[PDB]
A paper describes a structure:
The V3 loop of the HIV-1 envelope (Env) protein elicits a vigorous, but largely non-neutralizing antibody response directed to the V3-crown, whereas rare broadly neutralizing antibodies (bnAbs) target the V3-base. Challenging this view, we present V3-crown directed broadly neutralizing Designed Ankyrin Repeat Proteins (bnDs) matching the breadth of V3-base bnAbs. While most bnAbs target prefusion Env, V3-crown bnDs bind open Env conformations triggered by CD4 engagement. BnDs achieve breadth by focusing on highly conserved residues that are accessible in two distinct V3 conformations, one of which resembles CCR5-bound V3.
In order to define V3-crown epitopes that lead to broad neutralization, we co-crystallized bnDs with V3-IF (BG505), i.e., the V3-crown mimetic that all bnDs bound best. Considering this similarity, the conformation of V3 bound to bnD.2 will hereinafter be referred to as Post-CCR5-V3. Noteworthy, we observed that the Post-CCR5-V3 conformation is occasionally sampled spontaneously, possibly promoting the interaction with either CCR5 or bnD.2. Despite this observation, the different V3-crown mimetics, as well as linear V3-crown peptide, were able to adopt the Post-CCR5-V3 conformation when in complex with 63_B7 and bnD.2. It should be noted that 63_B7 and bnD.2 were selected using different panning targets (V3-IY mimetic and CD4-bound gp120, respectively), thus highlighting again that a common transient conformation of the V3 must exist. Despite different preferences for the Inter- or Post-CCR5-V3 conformation, the bnDs overlapped in their contact patterns, engaging mainly with R/H308, I309, P313, F317, and Y318. The R308 side chain engages via a salt bridge with bnD.1 and bnD.2. The bnDs make extensive contacts with Y318 and F317 which are exposed to opposite sides of the V3 loop in the Inter- and Post-CCR5-V3 conformations, due to the presence or absence of the helical turn. This enables bnD.2 to approach the V3-crown from the opposite side compared to bnD.1 and bnD.3, and to interact with several shared conserved contact residues on the V3-crown. MAb 10A37 targets a conformation closely related to Post-CCR5-V3 bound by bnD.245,46.
Numbering used by the authors:
A (entry chain D): 1 to 15
B (entry chain C): 13 to 138
Write the structure that this text describes.
């Protein structure tokens, strides 16, 4: 959850 | 759904399962039905170098994009996997690729404090 990736965090996170 | 199983095996770092699924009919360029991400996207994000290498060997598109415009290089640069960044670049990853907000892999390395990756990307953009 700490990684600044944008809206795509919904699919990838994870961290 | 062999494609979805391959996506999940890449996400989970299951090297043997990735190789077996592809030999058994899974498409190396499978994509998620809702967001377009590929196994290589997931391996680059999750940090599985050996899976990245086997997907590339088998024919994964190094410059595939998902629904947010992210490439595997964006994802590896954001999380901070230096070795994966270098492998992707060696295989032709587009250092200038912009996501849906105009952000490059370099921008994501900066945002996440991955200075060694940022320097690699800045120099590759020369
Ligand atoms: Cl998945
Ligand atoms: Cl770094
Ligand atoms: Mg491993
Ligand atoms: Mg740092």
């Amino acid at each position: 959850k700490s990684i600044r990736i944008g809206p795509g965090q919904a699919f990838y996170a994870x961290p | 759904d062999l494609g979805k199983k391959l996506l999940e095996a890449a996400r989970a770092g299951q090297d043997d399962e990735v190789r077996i699924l592809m030999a058994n009919g899974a498409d190396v360029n499978a994509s998620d039905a809702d967001v377009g991400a590929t196994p290589l996207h997931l391996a680059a994000w999750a940090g599985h170098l050996e899976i990245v290498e086997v997907l590339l060997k088998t024919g994964a598109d190094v410059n595939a994009v998902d629904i947010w415009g992210l490439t595997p290089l964006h994802l590896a640069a954001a999380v901070g996997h230096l070795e994966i960044v270098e492998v992707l670049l060696k295989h032709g990853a587009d250092v200038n690729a912009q996501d849906k907000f105009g952000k490059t892999p370099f921008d994501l390395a900066i945002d996440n404090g991955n200075e060694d990756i940022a320097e690699v990307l800045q120099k590759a953009a020369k």
